[model samples]
Target: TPVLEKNNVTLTGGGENVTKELKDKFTSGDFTVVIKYNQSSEKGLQALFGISNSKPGQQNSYVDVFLRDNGELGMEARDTSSNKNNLVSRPASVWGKYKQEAVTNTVAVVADSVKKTYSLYANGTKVVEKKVDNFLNIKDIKGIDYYMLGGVKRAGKTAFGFNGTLENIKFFNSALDEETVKKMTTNAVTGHLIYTANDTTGSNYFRIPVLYTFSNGRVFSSIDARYGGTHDFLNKINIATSYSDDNGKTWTKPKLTLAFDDFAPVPLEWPREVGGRDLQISGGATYIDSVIVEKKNKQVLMFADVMPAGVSFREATRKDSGYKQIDGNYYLKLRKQGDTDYNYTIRENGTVYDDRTNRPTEFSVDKNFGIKQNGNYLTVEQYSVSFKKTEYRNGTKVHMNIFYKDALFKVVPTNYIAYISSNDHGESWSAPTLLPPIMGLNRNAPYLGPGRGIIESSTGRILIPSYTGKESAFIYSDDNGASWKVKVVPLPSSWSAEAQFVELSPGVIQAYMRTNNGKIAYLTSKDAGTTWSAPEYLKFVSNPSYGTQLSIINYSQLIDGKKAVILSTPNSTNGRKHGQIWIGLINDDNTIDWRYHHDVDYSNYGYSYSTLTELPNHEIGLMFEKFDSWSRNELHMKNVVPYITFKIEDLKKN
Candidate 1:
């Protein structure tokens, strides 16, 4: 029997690559496996190398190393005697962001009997090391007669196939050292970089894509350039913008649409080993969840959440008084003499009082990002972020950059609304104007839903849907983006209630929002931008308790000669998966007849947030988060969010 073997293999989609002859050769204790492969699509859970001898049609025992959509590498050992799958995972993914077309990673796993440990390495970097007792009984391969490479074997059937190209495979009976393993897995394949995840632009991830077709036919897309992985809160982020003049064919390079000064916008090198690259964006200010709209006059406006540097949603105030109430009107809160806590009851304006006296204070902001009281900048201070060291899980290390943190880091600890406008389609734009006064001095500004806004044809009013703690707010601009107002409609439940509007009729608009329960809530606004009726649940769509963002658009082409609406949302009631696109026919009676729907991916593959827009060629454009948002293992996956197009004929078949 050969103690060492090498094979070049390739697998597509899902299905095992088995080798019974090889399985018989190494049916025992220890060995090192090295695989260099490139995935065609990095979507779901995929196996790299696995071995087992469980019978067909039954779960028995097996050991495997796999890659998650988010790039984390993990190993799983299972047996009939073991209570659960013994697993050890890499803290950070070695796969680069949105890099499926060409990028490849090298992985090596050394199971050493002497050390009683299995060490995993990626691209020359040591990721994780775990004890053999914590995994399968590596000392014996007794019942394991089956052997496989690039996938897992279940009940005599090959499954969990590797979806990419395999460059090389090597096996050694002896355990390999870290230096040896690193040298063996040094080669890498590169791919095109789309939406990079690094500090180069002071961002680690880009999310919440909002695409819109201007009245002049130019397409504009905006994304949340998050600097802290893919997490929604407690990170630094900015709204990055890109335009497509030639429809969806090509896109202009991304530029900062709405950003606050944090660190200088320069590239910062990040480590490939898990925790080596932390999700701290030097504690900079952030903007999130954007919505874009075109006014009747052809001017484009963008709206998003603006957070003062360190402020995160977990710490934001829910009180009805970030502003002060005076003479029946709300005003920006000012610090009075002797005020102890800087008062969340009333928040801010250009001017705030001195904390010492509790009386009116002198305040002047040098720039919007910095407030100067007297002659000194108030937001500047020495700050340090620390982490404790641990022997396990992506080595802990503390990083302190005072010049970047204190000088650029600024946070208001409260949420507010801000908007920017472009005069000539999407070629250029204006500075952001905060909408705190329009949103009400006492109430927190509504959080904008991720996607495009709508212009109601009846009154030509522009509407951007947003959500607050208590209700869903429809923020509308009647004077062609010159001014804005809000209409808060109570909800049946405490939901994120992120809503989308589609004009069902000339003056009748329907708002579809997310729910905490299991279904979507639908509300109607009949008087253009005025009051909305009570909520009604969507009978067709179902999801888990926690909600996800959705996109809906009123279509121009008729379905069966009837006005229609296109909706993109997750259809599964389990994890964020089974992304489906439904086409609904608007009847003459102001009701929707859901005509058809198609699943974007498998029911198990993730499909969470989605955005819908009608293309110039009448096909529908959909940009969606293609990972399981609810799965803790799937967090921070990059580039799975793709822009796909579907023609009307494609929908009709569904």
Candidate 2:
């Protein structure tokens, strides 16, 4: 009896291959195969379906349909005769730019001995056809007693394994007509949507997830909500946060942890054109890049940038110190609209007023950089314009700078560091406090390296990693955050250098950061973030020229009764995929021995910026931006950031 069977199946986690009995089914030289499936990760080569007699200690000789790392799909046939392998591949990848989505597609292949041809169909559309002499020689291959779906069995292991869901698998002993093949591979059910996005938070895209476990055991997670198309600069972005009291089992709706008033807190859909979307504000008072820390007093602090409305990092005035030294105290200065001079002072509680007239500007910035004015949102119309090699029709004039001096543009203080603290263990936060321009009368404020800061265990000091173009600024506080200061450590080369600190021992912490070169640089501070040694480069991990941010934290419980630290980063030599979490065993000498690791996803999925935190239960918590943060092709990816947990024992099998 020819039984008709169909069922929905999910193929993830690289599990055991789904097997099928197809010896008589595909024994003839002509057959048709159709499958409706979704690919989860685009990492390595994945076999959608394969038929082969794969024994141990040898590569398989089979016929298979596979998905390549570059998103392309094709059919391949390998025969023992002359050890020949023939393939018919599509030049265009049908998955396009939506592989991270849970969307499913229908794929089919028909081999016709009568016509002496092999054909491929995707989503009911015939893509291309090739002669059987070139590929899919079913008669030339051995018997197909062993058949598997979602992976190809090789000598030592399975190759080209699929990671998504599959459904509607149909096999016919005879070559199906083109219309019949198209009809068999249509209408697929979309898969699952993980992470959080496209909601009322006014954020459609997010990156650089930072997670933390407060001293009170509340779980905190924050991320960069890039409203203007996922680019770092030339856009409007905010720092939003979500919390979890029950570990990471569930999370609160995301809220703005730190932000600046610019237009409405609405999602801005930026264009993806090459030169079109690189636009940046000339000087829109905004905040970008943030870091968090918990003090010994159980106060949680968040540090972020304070940019003048319309100013971006590239064109901002880095020459003037963000402070005016008067009476031995550093006071913030603000530029009056349309005036060449900036004779203003921001006094206690972050109130901006004219020193000449003593009249307040109706605008007040809190310690967290959140703005308020006249009981309404202090807003402004901001724009970021660029004149590349190809200029607009009106010559090289009138860009975002026109919006800079425009009357509608709000006159706000220039760029600096502002932070907020929570006394109730993150349930409530204090007003934003502007960091005094302590770096001196020459340079702008040190840009913060996003993620968490450290409360130095040895001496009970607070340390947050910030960077200057010239050095690494270990911004610290000795008096329980009543006051703050900075210690600068020079570098061999200039690095964008977003760093995280891990406590190796009491009074000893190691800082690991991204580098301009393709290597992760490490520096050790022996005296509670005051003094540092030379920089050291880490091995076994490499990235592109623009290095990526990483997350590292010390483990409370011992693995094998040895001290351990967990690190999360992308391990790709080229793009920003292949995210891996590594566990380093602390040796007796205090050096970290990189011992074990596990891939967060596969090697080809998007795994760029990430944050790692140790949960109260001794498990590891990770909230990572689940795509290549650097790739322009992956702009506007939704619901990709996922918070995952792993136990100490999980690292062994990881």
Candidate 3:
């Protein structure tokens, strides 16, 4: 690379989404490019480059170039505004010198909307730049292209040779900085001593993301998976899946395709986050869920709601013995005065039947009894009582929450079980599917905050750990992930809420759940998720159960296949906004002996609804809601989401 104090840019990096400095560099539209560097082919992926067509608020508009593992180049972009993208990979490899043995080649993009011009260059030599003056984009016009370093997207649909190291990045406000432009010659440096992905320096431009991939390619080990097409009223939702192919080189995008019509079930309900500010974005009025596998189908699905949403139930029938009529129908209803409370008596043969004597009682105890005005007849049962005696039923399968057999489905019960899917691996996804309601007579769905689940290998059962204001339950699926069975996980007291689970081995599993008593209790399942051991104390880590979203990954491989797990929560004795990732590795036999955990960030931004994924390269990728939207100050847009990536080896053992 040129010595200090020279002109000409030798390398660059950009996509539809460039920093502010790159935005002012040139005329705009959409384009791919590279900077001029000393001609050298010693390095490939490291050869510097850039891209554009950037508009912050319009779409997820990103203009980025591709870098191969060795040394090759290309570009990939997408119009988050609408949905348009080139093939994932491309071919743009040429020789270039090295800088500090790092990178001598440069790539750049300049967007001057007025000039409506864009261009691509290699070593100060202009390759191409087209101007589409009539174009208007983002929300009104979308343009986006995310470059998967080695190729284009992680799967690399387009081919662009990439190998080696990249370094010496600089940005400018206008086209061609004379001294900077000339530095493209004789730059013999390449492959810097420190790697970009591992670099913690302020100037490091590349970030290695740790995404979750698995060995078995199954959603918690199952085959039956299906979920899609919720009502057209959805806004925001979250879907995550594992992508695995042979050799850990290629995978697919989240493939749950969406039909984008008004009645397409999955509609784009928000404005684009193109680097600007506009709050009309109603998407923040969101919905979210966790991944769970179906027992019967062995399919992967996610459960979330389109806030202020409804359940998957029956339409109101004009008469009794309604039998809920059919599936896919939802309604809000109330019964007339003389009706035996649907709560007090089971709906029998079109009429209410008193279980005590199997008597068909006739009574209208509304105001005189504890009748509630809520739609559900039980909504009145809690407040109604014409005459009553204390009677408690014994030995019922009191399941608090059920974990699905797969990691594809998540449960967020604001109103109903809304399930979503991702067909293209985990890159993109489909809208959500609302499951039938499952609340009991005493309670409508308690406001569930956040939680996690575990997939048992023995039965291939998925356990969703959940709770109400009173007790806790472990909802399960046996047939891979076909149907569900609700069974309670006995808590010492009636104050447990948001909980998380992780299966350690064939017949052993651990549940880390919280309680109102300021404790995080650990439970053990001895018979392969059939029954669990009593709650053990995780004395060191616990919160007041003030309602926090806790996340846990099944197991991470440390030294010698020792199984480990990563959990997110604020472990400080005091309630600071710190989020931590705990890596617990199992020792000989079936016990977890030690752990490696640390804080994600100490800010009160409260990173909630976090999910962990291990990438094929052994890197750990994490995504989470940056802030609690319930705080009101945290508008819906902030929910667009933020991510972090690092290797399992990067964490410190504690």
Candidate 4:
């Protein structure tokens, strides 16, 4: 039920004001204001409601609730008598959409004078709460007369005009309870938010959501749980997993499926005002960008790129494979503390052997990649980080890894890709297997494509997408998942990055990828990924120069009685915004006919790096980054990635 059932007002934002004279001014130091509105334009600082002196030379002496163009909601209270001025605000507070259109939001500002606290809520969710030293009420200002809606009064002139429709506005002399405020604003939001800031995972941020449906009718998801903000490098990040049995209605608790404990996963404040903390934190091991696929035998494989402590993508060596070949067998090479040459190798049954002599050393590595000797773990000092400073001095002792800076033995300083398998539909996972130096010792391993892999329907060959800086490496397997090989195809330009493959026919596959040429490039492989055609640009997509990752999948159901492929990508050339889903029909000549298109959200909302999958019930499941990952000002955002399902009928309506 609404707090106020009548007196709805609408404003055109062009010098419009609604004024009401009060019988008695609010003398009590507690108040609550609730507003339901739909904004037509977000151009400037607009006021929803205000109370001022309306006298000359007192423009700053007022109490008002205001909004900004960047989806920020704020409250300003000022009193000239005591010289007390308070402003409280929250960013990205009221910019959600309903069915890819303008949304109606319920916002409230509550002030408790006794507790000196202010709270802001958007659609039943409290976004920010603050405590202040000085509190001001409406009666604190001299000559308090009346209140105005849709604009603030300054010297008898309309200021800060609003350009929106106010459905309901209510004012109470006392602060409302939280339960009462939540009831009035519930059931007004769309989509399911799986990860929020500072949840039970003890992490403040998450990115790169990958969604897939297994053969047993289970939906699975994985993301990067960032602990030290949203920056890609120089942070403590872990791969978190969640599953659903009855589609996406309910999800299990998130678990750290692939992680490293060298650095603690504690939330550190990374301020958006300063564009987030961008430096590297010592001893922060990370696992990022996951890809999942289920094989023909019903076994699931999950892959991710692993980084050791203090090593990042730009700093990793590109010439070392971290392995040494001896007697026609490749072994993980390691160097002792005082040795200049790499003389130790991890051999059969996790034993460390000395290559200088055919002898077994006393040290070995455990399944979790921790070093141990004499059946006990070796420990190293941990590094601590905060907003003020980073300390590498005396700290808590932790299990040592060969990749750690202070370990007795060390592997080559480079990035590597590893995989883990699950036999019971993602219920449990097997030990990780590092893809053996398949690119050879002179080149580094290719990065995982960060989505789902595919199995060629005709030959039963398992293909996983990967890429170097210049080429696309299609990692495939012939005899199921026993052995894997790579077929490298050089791209036309040196700007190619992540990619995804969809089998157009039994042996013909198409690869859609990100590029620096401001368009998506598609390449064809007719001989089951052995040979490739030249790159051809997609004419329908208009994206930024440095393109973002896209998702494409073959829909099981026909649309308008034609074979269809669905693509999800941001269509705006300005920034990563205006996400759209496009449907292309496969023609007789193996070309695509660009047909229907629909927007995922409003034209101004942020969307980047998306993944698409077909559910068991034939619904299209999409999970994407709802904020611009490439923008510096939009860093360290929370609750931005959401999972939404759509039917084929919804895509055709546009």
- Which has the better lDDT: candidate 2, or candidate 3? 2
Q: What's the C-alpha lDDT at position 17 in model 2?
A: 45
Clashes (candidate 4)? 0
lDDT of 3 by residue, 1-654 (tens): 211122342222321222333433333332323243432233234323323232344333434454443223343344554555532221222232211233345555433345544434434333234455343321123333332222222221223333433333443334443334434421322111111111221111111111334334421111100111111123222222324463233333332221111111122222212232122211112333344432323334444322321222122121222113113332222233344433233232223334345454552122111222222222200110011112122333211111111101112213434444444433444444434334442233422324334567677777766555565656666755446556655466765356667777777877776665666667777786677777776655755445355666665465446777777665543442345777777766766754677656432324444556565556665655434422322222211233455566555632
- For all predicted structures, in order, the TM-scores are 0.72, 0.71, 0.44, 0.88
> Which prediction has more favorable lDDT, 3 or 4?
4
Q: Score candidate 4 by lDDT.
A: 0.79
User: For model 1, where is the 10-residue window of minimal lDDT?
Assistant: 389-398
Q: Sort every candidate by lDDT, greatest first.
A: 4, 2, 1, 3
RMSD of 4: 3.7
TM-score, candidate number 4: 0.88
Q: State, as a TM-score between 0 and 1, how close model 3 is to the true structure.
A: 0.44
For 49-157, candidate 2 gives per-residue lDDT tens digits of 7777577533647888877664446888776644777776652224422323454678888778777777887664565576755445566676444567777777636
Q: Per-residue lDDT of 1-654 in model 4, one digit per residue for the tens?
A: 222233557787753343443426354846788888877777788988877877877777788888876566789888765678899876656764545456787888888887778878776666567788877777766665547787778787778888888888887777788878766655446336666666656787898889999889999998889887788887788898888888787788788888877776667666655533455455677788898889988999999988877787889989988998888988888988999998999988779999999799999988777899987899988766666556454578888888677789888778888899999988899888878888887788888888888888888888888888888888988898888889888887775568888878779889889988889988898988888899999987888888888888888877777788998999889888878888888876778887888788666667888988888899888888877889876677666677888887777655
Between candidates 2 and 3, the TM-score winner: 2
- The whole-model C-alpha lDDT of candidate 3 against the native structure comes to 0.39
Cα RMSD, each candidate: 7.6, 10.1, 17.8, 3.7
Q: For every model in order, what is the number of clashing pairs? A: 15, 21, 156, 0
